[PDB]
């Protein structure tokens, strides 16, 4: 568990969000859905060091 962070690094639109997920899969799914909702879909990365994900459109 813990608080995860998402970094939307899009060519068109960018943003950031944070959510409390039980595991990395739940985190990645919530964020995938969130990014796709913002119309962001690029190379997804992860930084366990600070529990963050970055999607580079």
mmCIF file with all atom_site columns, N, CA and C in Angstrom:
data_model
loop_
_atom_site.group_PDB
_atom_site.id
_atom_site.type_symbol
_atom_site.label_atom_id
_atom_site.label_alt_id
_atom_site.label_comp_id
_atom_site.label_asym_id
_atom_site.label_entity_id
_atom_site.label_seq_id
_atom_site.pdbx_PDB_ins_code
_atom_site.Cartn_x
_atom_site.Cartn_y
_atom_site.Cartn_z
_atom_site.occupancy
_atom_site.B_iso_or_equiv
_atom_site.pdbx_formal_charge
_atom_site.auth_seq_id
_atom_site.auth_comp_id
_atom_site.auth_asym_id
_atom_site.auth_atom_id
_atom_site.pdbx_PDB_model_num
ATOM 1   N N  . UNK A 1 1  ? 0.859  -1.196 0.000   1.00 0.00 ? 1  UNK A N  1
ATOM 2   C CA . UNK A 1 1  ? 0.000  0.000  0.000   1.00 0.00 ? 1  UNK A CA 1
ATOM 3   C C  . UNK A 1 1  ? 0.895  1.246  0.000   1.00 0.00 ? 1  UNK A C  1
ATOM 4   N N  . UNK A 1 2  ? 0.303  2.434  0.108   1.00 0.00 ? 2  UNK A N  1
ATOM 5   C CA . UNK A 1 2  ? 0.962  3.727  0.116   1.00 0.00 ? 2  UNK A CA 1
ATOM 6   C C  . UNK A 1 2  ? 0.243  4.678  -0.830  1.00 0.00 ? 2  UNK A C  1
ATOM 7   N N  . UNK A 1 3  ? 0.767  5.896  -0.926  1.00 0.00 ? 3  UNK A N  1
ATOM 8   C CA . UNK A 1 3  ? 0.234  6.952  -1.768  1.00 0.00 ? 3  UNK A CA 1
ATOM 9   C C  . UNK A 1 3  ? 1.098  6.973  -3.016  1.00 0.00 ? 3  UNK A C  1
ATOM 10  N N  . UNK A 1 4  ? 0.478  6.762  -4.161  1.00 0.00 ? 4  UNK A N  1
ATOM 11  C CA . UNK A 1 4  ? 1.129  6.748  -5.453  1.00 0.00 ? 4  UNK A CA 1
ATOM 12  C C  . UNK A 1 4  ? 0.903  8.099  -6.113  1.00 0.00 ? 4  UNK A C  1
ATOM 13  N N  . UNK A 1 5  ? 1.747  8.448  -7.079  1.00 0.00 ? 5  UNK A N  1
ATOM 14  C CA . UNK A 1 5  ? 1.667  9.695  -7.829  1.00 0.00 ? 5  UNK A CA 1
ATOM 15  C C  . UNK A 1 5  ? 1.804  9.376  -9.307  1.00 0.00 ? 5  UNK A C  1
ATOM 16  N N  . UNK A 1 6  ? 1.108  10.125 -10.147 1.00 0.00 ? 6  UNK A N  1
ATOM 17  C CA . UNK A 1 6  ? 1.143  9.981  -11.593 1.00 0.00 ? 6  UNK A CA 1
ATOM 18  C C  . UNK A 1 6  ? 1.577  11.307 -12.173 1.00 0.00 ? 6  UNK A C  1
ATOM 19  N N  . UNK A 1 7  ? 2.441  11.228 -13.175 1.00 0.00 ? 7  UNK A N  1
ATOM 20  C CA . UNK A 1 7  ? 2.983  12.358 -13.905 1.00 0.00 ? 7  UNK A CA 1
ATOM 21  C C  . UNK A 1 7  ? 2.601  12.151 -15.370 1.00 0.00 ? 7  UNK A C  1
ATOM 22  N N  . UNK A 1 8  ? 1.632  12.927 -15.838 1.00 0.00 ? 8  UNK A N  1
ATOM 23  C CA . UNK A 1 8  ? 1.141  12.900 -17.202 1.00 0.00 ? 8  UNK A CA 1
ATOM 24  C C  . UNK A 1 8  ? 2.077  13.820 -17.984 1.00 0.00 ? 8  UNK A C  1
ATOM 25  N N  . UNK A 1 9  ? 2.965  13.224 -18.776 1.00 0.00 ? 9  UNK A N  1
ATOM 26  C CA . UNK A 1 9  ? 3.944  13.912 -19.621 1.00 0.00 ? 9  UNK A CA 1
ATOM 27  C C  . UNK A 1 9  ? 3.508  13.777 -21.083 1.00 0.00 ? 9  UNK A C  1
ATOM 28  N N  . UNK A 1 10 ? 2.476  14.508 -21.490 1.00 0.00 ? 10 UNK A N  1
ATOM 29  C CA . UNK A 1 10 ? 1.974  14.442 -22.842 1.00 0.00 ? 10 UNK A CA 1
ATOM 30  C C  . UNK A 1 10 ? 2.484  15.523 -23.768 1.00 0.00 ? 10 UNK A C  1
ATOM 31  N N  . UNK A 1 11 ? 2.506  15.172 -25.047 1.00 0.00 ? 11 UNK A N  1
ATOM 32  C CA . UNK A 1 11 ? 2.922  16.044 -26.132 1.00 0.00 ? 11 UNK A CA 1
ATOM 33  C C  . UNK A 1 11 ? 1.889  17.137 -26.325 1.00 0.00 ? 11 UNK A C  1
ATOM 34  N N  . UNK A 1 12 ? 0.648  16.876 -25.929 1.00 0.00 ? 12 UNK A N  1
ATOM 35  C CA . UNK A 1 12 ? -0.464 17.774 -26.109 1.00 0.00 ? 12 UNK A CA 1
ATOM 36  C C  . UNK A 1 12 ? -0.940 18.390 -24.796 1.00 0.00 ? 12 UNK A C  1
ATOM 37  N N  . UNK A 1 13 ? -1.159 17.565 -23.771 1.00 0.00 ? 13 UNK A N  1
ATOM 38  C CA . UNK A 1 13 ? -1.642 17.973 -22.457 1.00 0.00 ? 13 UNK A CA 1
ATOM 39  C C  . UNK A 1 13 ? -0.820 17.275 -21.397 1.00 0.00 ? 13 UNK A C  1
ATOM 40  N N  . UNK A 1 14 ? -0.606 17.903 -20.238 1.00 0.00 ? 14 UNK A N  1
ATOM 41  C CA . UNK A 1 14 ? 0.154  17.376 -19.101 1.00 0.00 ? 14 UNK A CA 1
ATOM 42  C C  . UNK A 1 14 ? -0.604 17.644 -17.799 1.00 0.00 ? 14 UNK A C  1
ATOM 43  N N  . UNK A 1 15 ? -0.272 16.930 -16.725 1.00 0.00 ? 15 UNK A N  1
ATOM 44  C CA . UNK A 1 15 ? -0.907 17.084 -15.420 1.00 0.00 ? 15 UNK A CA 1
ATOM 45  C C  . UNK A 1 15 ? -0.320 16.116 -14.391 1.00 0.00 ? 15 UNK A C  1
ATOM 46  N N  . UNK A 1 16 ? -0.826 16.138 -13.158 1.00 0.00 ? 16 UNK A N  1
ATOM 47  C CA . UNK A 1 16 ? -0.381 15.266 -12.071 1.00 0.00 ? 16 UNK A CA 1
ATOM 48  C C  . UNK A 1 16 ? -1.566 14.939 -11.156 1.00 0.00 ? 16 UNK A C  1
ATOM 49  N N  . UNK A 1 17 ? -1.541 13.761 -10.541 1.00 0.00 ? 17 UNK A N  1
ATOM 50  C CA . UNK A 1 17 ? -2.549 13.269 -9.612  1.00 0.00 ? 17 UNK A CA 1
ATOM 51  C C  . UNK A 1 17 ? -1.865 12.318 -8.626  1.00 0.00 ? 17 UNK A C  1
ATOM 52  N N  . UNK A 1 18 ? -2.535 12.019 -7.517  1.00 0.00 ? 18 UNK A N  1
ATOM 53  C CA . UNK A 1 18 ? -2.073 11.137 -6.463  1.00 0.00 ? 18 UNK A CA 1
ATOM 54  C C  . UNK A 1 18 ? -3.261 10.302 -5.980  1.00 0.00 ? 18 UNK A C  1
ATOM 55  N N  . UNK A 1 19 ? -3.059 9.015  -5.701  1.00 0.00 ? 19 UNK A N  1
ATOM 56  C CA . UNK A 1 19 ? -4.109 8.133  -5.201  1.00 0.00 ? 19 UNK A CA 1
ATOM 57  C C  . UNK A 1 19 ? -3.477 7.111  -4.251  1.00 0.00 ? 19 UNK A C  1
ATOM 58  N N  . UNK A 1 20 ? -4.228 6.614  -3.275  1.00 0.00 ? 20 UNK A N  1
ATOM 59  C CA . UNK A 1 20 ? -3.775 5.628  -2.311  1.00 0.00 ? 20 UNK A CA 1
ATOM 60  C C  . UNK A 1 20 ? -4.175 4.277  -2.877  1.00 0.00 ? 20 UNK A C  1
ATOM 61  N N  . UNK A 1 21 ? -3.207 3.451  -3.275  1.00 0.00 ? 21 UNK A N  1
ATOM 62  C CA . UNK A 1 21 ? -3.497 2.132  -3.836  1.00 0.00 ? 21 UNK A CA 1
ATOM 63  C C  . UNK A 1 21 ? -2.905 1.030  -2.967  1.00 0.00 ? 21 UNK A C  1
ATOM 64  N N  . UNK A 1 22 ? -3.614 -0.090 -2.899  1.00 0.00 ? 22 UNK A N  1
ATOM 65  C CA . UNK A 1 22 ? -3.259 -1.261 -2.108  1.00 0.00 ? 22 UNK A CA 1
ATOM 66  C C  . UNK A 1 22 ? -2.003 -1.970 -2.616  1.00 0.00 ? 22 UNK A C  1
ATOM 67  N N  . UNK A 1 23 ? -1.754 -1.953 -3.926  1.00 0.00 ? 23 UNK A N  1
ATOM 68  C CA . UNK A 1 23 ? -0.624 -2.574 -4.604  1.00 0.00 ? 23 UNK A CA 1
ATOM 69  C C  . UNK A 1 23 ? -0.351 -1.793 -5.888  1.00 0.00 ? 23 UNK A C  1
ATOM 70  N N  . UNK A 1 24 ? 0.804  -2.061 -6.504  1.00 0.00 ? 24 UNK A N  1
ATOM 71  C CA . UNK A 1 24 ? 1.238  -1.400 -7.724  1.00 0.00 ? 24 UNK A CA 1
ATOM 72  C C  . UNK A 1 24 ? 0.303  -1.673 -8.896  1.00 0.00 ? 24 UNK A C  1
ATOM 73  N N  . UNK A 1 25 ? -0.335 -2.847 -8.960  1.00 0.00 ? 25 UNK A N  1
ATOM 74  C CA . UNK A 1 25 ? -1.242 -3.152 -10.060 1.00 0.00 ? 25 UNK A CA 1
ATOM 75  C C  . UNK A 1 25 ? -2.460 -2.246 -9.978  1.00 0.00 ? 25 UNK A C  1
ATOM 76  N N  . UNK A 1 26 ? -3.059 -2.132 -8.797  1.00 0.00 ? 26 UNK A N  1
ATOM 77  C CA . UNK A 1 26 ? -4.208 -1.274 -8.577  1.00 0.00 ? 26 UNK A CA 1
ATOM 78  C C  . UNK A 1 26 ? -3.798 0.155  -8.930  1.00 0.00 ? 26 UNK A C  1
ATOM 79  N N  . UNK A 1 27 ? -2.610 0.581  -8.483  1.00 0.00 ? 27 UNK A N  1
ATOM 80  C CA . UNK A 1 27 ? -2.118 1.916  -8.748  1.00 0.00 ? 27 UNK A CA 1
ATOM 81  C C  . UNK A 1 27 ? -2.021 2.179  -10.250 1.00 0.00 ? 27 UNK A C  1
ATOM 82  N N  . UNK A 1 28 ? -1.366 1.266  -10.959 1.00 0.00 ? 28 UNK A N  1
ATOM 83  C CA . UNK A 1 28 ? -1.150 1.333  -12.388 1.00 0.00 ? 28 UNK A CA 1
ATOM 84  C C  . UNK A 1 28 ? -2.471 1.316  -13.155 1.00 0.00 ? 28 UNK A C  1
ATOM 85  N N  . UNK A 1 29 ? -3.457 0.527  -12.720 1.00 0.00 ? 29 UNK A N  1
ATOM 86  C CA . UNK A 1 29 ? -4.764 0.452  -13.370 1.00 0.00 ? 29 UNK A CA 1
ATOM 87  C C  . UNK A 1 29 ? -5.504 1.773  -13.169 1.00 0.00 ? 29 UNK A C  1
ATOM 88  N N  . UNK A 1 30 ? -5.581 2.285  -11.932 1.00 0.00 ? 30 UNK A N  1
ATOM 89  C CA . UNK A 1 30 ? -6.267 3.548  -11.647 1.00 0.00 ? 30 UNK A CA 1
ATOM 90  C C  . UNK A 1 30 ? -5.664 4.641  -12.511 1.00 0.00 ? 30 UNK A C  1
ATOM 91  N N  . UNK A 1 31 ? -4.337 4.751  -12.488 1.00 0.00 ? 31 UNK A N  1
ATOM 92  C CA . UNK A 1 31 ? -3.638 5.745  -13.266 1.00 0.00 ? 31 UNK A CA 1
ATOM 93  C C  . UNK A 1 31 ? -3.825 5.523  -14.758 1.00 0.00 ? 31 UNK A C  1
ATOM 94  N N  . UNK A 1 32 ? -3.793 4.288  -15.273 1.00 0.00 ? 32 UNK A N  1
ATOM 95  C CA . UNK A 1 32 ? -3.997 4.038  -16.704 1.00 0.00 ? 32 UNK A CA 1
ATOM 96  C C  . UNK A 1 32 ? -5.328 4.616  -17.130 1.00 0.00 ? 32 UNK A C  1
ATOM 97  N N  . UNK A 1 33 ? -6.372 4.296  -16.375 1.00 0.00 ? 33 UNK A N  1
ATOM 98  C CA . UNK A 1 33 ? -7.707 4.757  -16.627 1.00 0.00 ? 33 UNK A CA 1
ATOM 99  C C  . UNK A 1 33 ? -7.724 6.279  -16.587 1.00 0.00 ? 33 UNK A C  1
ATOM 100 N N  . UNK A 1 34 ? -7.053 6.866  -15.593 1.00 0.00 ? 34 UNK A N  1
ATOM 101 C CA . UNK A 1 34 ? -7.028 8.312  -15.432 1.00 0.00 ? 34 UNK A CA 1
ATOM 102 C C  . UNK A 1 34 ? -6.335 9.007  -16.600 1.00 0.00 ? 34 UNK A C  1
ATOM 103 N N  . UNK A 1 35 ? -5.187 8.498  -17.027 1.00 0.00 ? 35 UNK A N  1
ATOM 104 C CA . UNK A 1 35 ? -4.433 9.090  -18.124 1.00 0.00 ? 35 UNK A CA 1
ATOM 105 C C  . UNK A 1 35 ? -5.231 9.019  -19.417 1.00 0.00 ? 35 UNK A C  1
ATOM 106 N N  . UNK A 1 36 ? -5.769 7.839  -19.731 1.00 0.00 ? 36 UNK A N  1
ATOM 107 C CA . UNK A 1 36 ? -6.578 7.623  -20.928 1.00 0.00 ? 36 UNK A CA 1
ATOM 108 C C  . UNK A 1 36 ? -7.792 8.556  -20.905 1.00 0.00 ? 36 UNK A C  1
ATOM 109 N N  . UNK A 1 37 ? -8.321 8.881  -19.720 1.00 0.00 ? 37 UNK A N  1
ATOM 110 C CA . UNK A 1 37 ? -9.467 9.778  -19.582 1.00 0.00 ? 37 UNK A CA 1
ATOM 111 C C  . UNK A 1 37 ? -9.045 11.181 -20.011 1.00 0.00 ? 37 UNK A C  1
ATOM 112 N N  . UNK A 1 38 ? -7.819 11.581 -19.667 1.00 0.00 ? 38 UNK A N  1
ATOM 113 C CA . UNK A 1 38 ? -7.252 12.876 -20.043 1.00 0.00 ? 38 UNK A CA 1
ATOM 114 C C  . UNK A 1 38 ? -6.762 12.813 -21.500 1.00 0.00 ? 38 UNK A C  1
ATOM 115 N N  . UNK A 1 39 ? -6.814 11.646 -22.153 1.00 0.00 ? 39 UNK A N  1
ATOM 116 C CA . UNK A 1 39 ? -6.378 11.416 -23.523 1.00 0.00 ? 39 UNK A CA 1
ATOM 117 C C  . UNK A 1 39 ? -4.864 11.315 -23.622 1.00 0.00 ? 39 UNK A C  1
ATOM 118 N N  . UNK A 1 40 ? -4.204 10.819 -22.577 1.00 0.00 ? 40 UNK A N  1
ATOM 119 C CA . UNK A 1 40 ? -2.766 10.646 -22.511 1.00 0.00 ? 40 UNK A CA 1
ATOM 120 C C  . UNK A 1 40 ? -2.491 9.159  -22.550 1.00 0.00 ? 40 UNK A C  1
ATOM 121 N N  . UNK A 1 41 ? -1.684 8.748  -23.516 1.00 0.00 ? 41 UNK A N  1
ATOM 122 C CA . UNK A 1 41 ? -1.291 7.364  -23.652 1.00 0.00 ? 41 UNK A CA 1
ATOM 123 C C  . UNK A 1 41 ? 0.065  7.353  -24.330 1.00 0.00 ? 41 UNK A C  1
ATOM 124 N N  . UNK A 1 42 ? 1.101  7.102  -23.540 1.00 0.00 ? 42 UNK A N  1
ATOM 125 C CA . UNK A 1 42 ? 2.480  7.047  -23.965 1.00 0.00 ? 42 UNK A CA 1
ATOM 126 C C  . UNK A 1 42 ? 3.237  5.954  -23.235 1.00 0.00 ? 42 UNK A C  1
ATOM 127 N N  . UNK A 1 43 ? 4.555  6.097  -23.171 1.00 0.00 ? 43 UNK A N  1
ATOM 128 C CA . UNK A 1 43 ? 5.429  5.146  -22.508 1.00 0.00 ? 43 UNK A CA 1
ATOM 129 C C  . UNK A 1 43 ? 5.284  5.307  -20.999 1.00 0.00 ? 43 UNK A C  1
ATOM 130 N N  . UNK A 1 44 ? 4.737  4.284  -20.346 1.00 0.00 ? 44 UNK A N  1
ATOM 131 C CA . UNK A 1 44 ? 4.546  4.263  -18.910 1.00 0.00 ? 44 UNK A CA 1
ATOM 132 C C  . UNK A 1 44 ? 5.826  3.768  -18.234 1.00 0.00 ? 44 UNK A C  1
ATOM 133 N N  . UNK A 1 45 ? 6.259  4.477  -17.202 1.00 0.00 ? 45 UNK A N  1
ATOM 134 C CA . UNK A 1 45 ? 7.443  4.229  -16.390 1.00 0.00 ? 45 UNK A CA 1
ATOM 135 C C  . UNK A 1 45 ? 7.041  4.178  -14.908 1.00 0.00 ? 45 UNK A C  1
ATOM 136 N N  . UNK A 1 46 ? 7.945  3.800  -14.006 1.00 0.00 ? 46 UNK A N  1
ATOM 137 C CA . UNK A 1 46 ? 7.691  3.724  -12.573 1.00 0.00 ? 46 UNK A CA 1
ATOM 138 C C  . UNK A 1 46 ? 8.976  4.079  -11.825 1.00 0.00 ? 46 UNK A C  1
ATOM 139 N N  . UNK A 1 47 ? 8.841  4.665  -10.636 1.00 0.00 ? 47 UNK A N  1
ATOM 140 C CA . UNK A 1 47 ? 9.907  5.072  -9.732  1.00 0.00 ? 47 UNK A CA 1
ATOM 141 C C  . UNK A 1 47 ? 9.455  4.627  -8.349  1.00 0.00 ? 47 UNK A C  1
ATOM 142 N N  . UNK A 1 48 ? 9.834  3.415  -7.951  1.00 0.00 ? 48 UNK A N  1
ATOM 143 C CA . UNK A 1 48 ? 9.493  2.844  -6.648  1.00 0.00 ? 48 UNK A CA 1
ATOM 144 C C  . UNK A 1 48 ? 10.065 3.677  -5.507  1.00 0.00 ? 48 UNK A C  1
ATOM 145 N N  . UNK A 1 49 ? 11.185 4.341  -5.796  1.00 0.00 ? 49 UNK A N  1
ATOM 146 C CA . UNK A 1 49 ? 11.940 5.212  -4.903  1.00 0.00 ? 49 UNK A CA 1
ATOM 147 C C  . UNK A 1 49 ? 11.049 6.252  -4.226  1.00 0.00 ? 49 UNK A C  1
ATOM 148 N N  . UNK A 1 50 ? 10.022 6.738  -4.926  1.00 0.00 ? 50 UNK A N  1
ATOM 149 C CA . UNK A 1 50 ? 9.084  7.717  -4.390  1.00 0.00 ? 50 UNK A CA 1
ATOM 150 C C  . UNK A 1 50 ? 7.632  7.335  -4.756  1.00 0.00 ? 50 UNK A C  1
ATOM 151 N N  . UNK A 1 51 ? 7.424  6.092  -5.216  1.00 0.00 ? 51 UNK A N  1
ATOM 152 C CA . UNK A 1 51 ? 6.165  5.487  -5.650  1.00 0.00 ? 51 UNK A CA 1
ATOM 153 C C  . UNK A 1 51 ? 5.424  6.377  -6.650  1.00 0.00 ? 51 UNK A C  1
ATOM 154 N N  . UNK A 1 52 ? 6.048  6.621  -7.801  1.00 0.00 ? 52 UNK A N  1
ATOM 155 C CA . UNK A 1 52 ? 5.488  7.460  -8.850  1.00 0.00 ? 52 UNK A CA 1
ATOM 156 C C  . UNK A 1 52 ? 5.522  6.753  -10.197 1.00 0.00 ? 52 UNK A C  1
ATOM 157 N N  . UNK A 1 53 ? 4.618  7.137  -11.093 1.00 0.00 ? 53 UNK A N  1
ATOM 158 C CA . UNK A 1 53 ? 4.468  6.630  -12.446 1.00 0.00 ? 53 UNK A CA 1
ATOM 159 C C  . UNK A 1 53 ? 4.519  7.830  -13.378 1.00 0.00 ? 53 UNK A C  1
ATOM 160 N N  . UNK A 1 54 ? 5.108  7.696  -14.567 1.00 0.00 ? 54 UNK A N  1
ATOM 161 C CA . UNK A 1 54 ? 5.173  8.795  -15.520 1.00 0.00 ? 54 UNK A CA 1
ATOM 162 C C  . UNK A 1 54 ? 4.804  8.226  -16.883 1.00 0.00 ? 54 UNK A C  1
ATOM 163 N N  . UNK A 1 55 ? 3.842  8.825  -17.579 1.00 0.00 ? 55 UNK A N  1
ATOM 164 C CA . UNK A 1 55 ? 3.406  8.383  -18.899 1.00 0.00 ? 55 UNK A CA 1
ATOM 165 C C  . UNK A 1 55 ? 3.874  9.454  -19.872 1.00 0.00 ? 55 UNK A C  1
ATOM 166 N N  . UNK A 1 56 ? 4.816  9.101  -20.740 1.00 0.00 ? 56 UNK A N  1
ATOM 167 C CA . UNK A 1 56 ? 5.385  10.022 -21.710 1.00 0.00 ? 56 UNK A CA 1
ATOM 168 C C  . UNK A 1 56 ? 4.764  9.793  -23.093 1.00 0.00 ? 56 UNK A C  1
ATOM 169 N N  . UNK A 1 57 ? 3.743  10.577 -23.438 1.00 0.00 ? 57 UNK A N  1
ATOM 170 C CA . UNK A 1 57 ? 3.039  10.536 -24.721 1.00 0.00 ? 57 UNK A CA 1
ATOM 171 C C  . UNK A 1 57 ? 4.077  10.842 -25.795 1.00 0.00 ? 57 UNK A C  1
#
